[PDB]
Amino acid sequence: GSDGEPLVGGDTDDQLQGGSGADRLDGGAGDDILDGGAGRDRLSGGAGADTFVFSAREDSYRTDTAVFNDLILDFEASEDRIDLSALGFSGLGDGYGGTLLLKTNAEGTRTYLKSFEADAEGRRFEVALDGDHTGDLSAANVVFAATGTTTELEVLGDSGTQAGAIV
């Protein structure tokens, strides 16, 4: 059941990876970069502004007889970030022919999305995020993914790269 090589240790900045199998990597406290790897694994950066690196070199999809879905733990959108430049397009739709689809569990605590999936017998890419604080991501919570500048001034009272107001 709970077996393999869990790596609990990252108190000084570096890069930590699970690789593959059953490897629960947990840094602990930092501004470190972590990667859950292939297989069916779980990751938690720790209490910090961690960088959840994902590059789907090892990750692909889950199937009916083999789930290799990544499971992100104790996510804090106020600090945690994610390297999703090559994973997850910018044009939503349904996760089909170059589209993306997101969904939330009953309480919204868990955000489940699919970056380019197929048929239920072919292969379906699906990830599992287990939130604790804010279960929402934005332009800061994710890598810039070679985006443009933000020399914008389209706010009333405050400033920021996201138009909005409170009335």
Swiss-Prot record:
Where in the cell is the protein located?
Answer: Secreted
Q: Which residues lie within the region annotated Disordered?
A: 1-41
Q: Where are the Hemolysin-type calcium-binding repeats?
A: 17-34, 35-52
Q: What is known of its domains?
A: Composed of one catalytically active A module and one R module.
Q: What else is known?
A: Each enzyme of this family of C5 epimerases introduces its own characteristic sequence distribution of G-blocks in their substrates, explaining the extensive sequence variability of alginates. These alginates of varying composition have different physical properties and are necessary at different stages of the bacterium life cycle.
What this protein is reported to do is described as: Converts beta-D-mannuronic acid (M) to alpha-L-guluronic acid (G), but introduces almost exclusively MG blocks, producing a polymer with non-gel-forming capacity.
Family designation? Belongs to the D-mannuronate C5-epimerase family.
Q: Specify the protein name.
A: Mannuronan C5-epimerase AlgE4
Please tell me the species this chain comes from. Azotobacter vinelandii
* Whole sequence portion shown: 387 to 553 of 553
